[PDB]
Symmetry: C3
Subunit: 114 residues, 3 copies
């Protein structure tokens, strides 16, 4: 799976280890070995949410399976909790788009998972 977070919070505010925490937490949440989890954090972004420049985050979670109505409502709680505590971002200023990818459309190690 892949989790990406874009935020206007400054780099100095992203704790070292936030990537590893996300990796471990998502591995448990998606029931997959942490080795398959990739995380990407992009701070100091020029963004607005509701026309306001207060801390916010635009994120995405891509995974081959393990995505759905119920699982997604669950991930939102996990991720908003992490963004709230580690990045000081209010939960109502967080968007997380979920993508259930076909193995044929995920390239890795010179091939695809199909």
């Amino acid at each position: 799976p892949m989790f990406i977070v874009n935020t206007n919070v400054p780099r100095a505010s992203v704790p070292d280890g936030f990537l590893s925490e996300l990796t471990q937490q998502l591995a448990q949440a998606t029931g997959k070995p942490p080795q398959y989890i990739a995380v990407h954090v992009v701070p100091d972004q020029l963004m607005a949410f509701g026309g306001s420049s207060e801390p916010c985050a635009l994120c995405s979670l891509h995974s081959i399976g393990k995505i759905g109505g119920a699982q997604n409502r669950s991930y939102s709680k996990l991720l908003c909790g992490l963004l709230a505590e580690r990045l000081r971002i209010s939960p109502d200023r967080v968007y997380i788009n979920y993508y259930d990818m076909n193995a044929a459309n995920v390239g890795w190690n010179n091939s695809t998972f199909a």
Copy 2:
């Protein structure tokens, strides 16, 4: 909805209130409340369009509904117009990918919109 623009244009070229203008313009075009409209601008990017490094932009508009053939043509005219006027990017060097998201795949404030 969420609008993101990645461009090689320098940060300094981004006029003040640009994020607010995008928010306001998209509120009108999509008919959705500005309170839930997110905008993200990423300048100084290393990119090429047609192999050329002249001003260009790669954008995306995600929305739950309000996406379609006719509406997308209208959004493109609006957004390309804004990029040309405000960022001095020629419309023929702009790509905008549109995404109609299922409510169940849009996470926000510890849940999804489904």
Copy 3:
């Protein structure tokens, strides 16, 4: 088509002409004129793959058609090979998401390809 690569490799490690090679190689690979190919490289990113901060990359290839089972495997071998040879990134530390876009969902030059 559009190819995006996000990586933790430093900007100074990207060889001169990398965007040109991608443009040229992707045009050949997808069969589309290089004029229609856009490339975006984002180095110095804060990311991890498998909980490791070693060189890695998260990429995406969007195209109207020219995407499928066999084609994606071919694109992956091509792209992972380039990232390995030019950026020194191990192929098993690269993810490439493929997207077959509907023409109506791709804006350009004040309109859409629909």
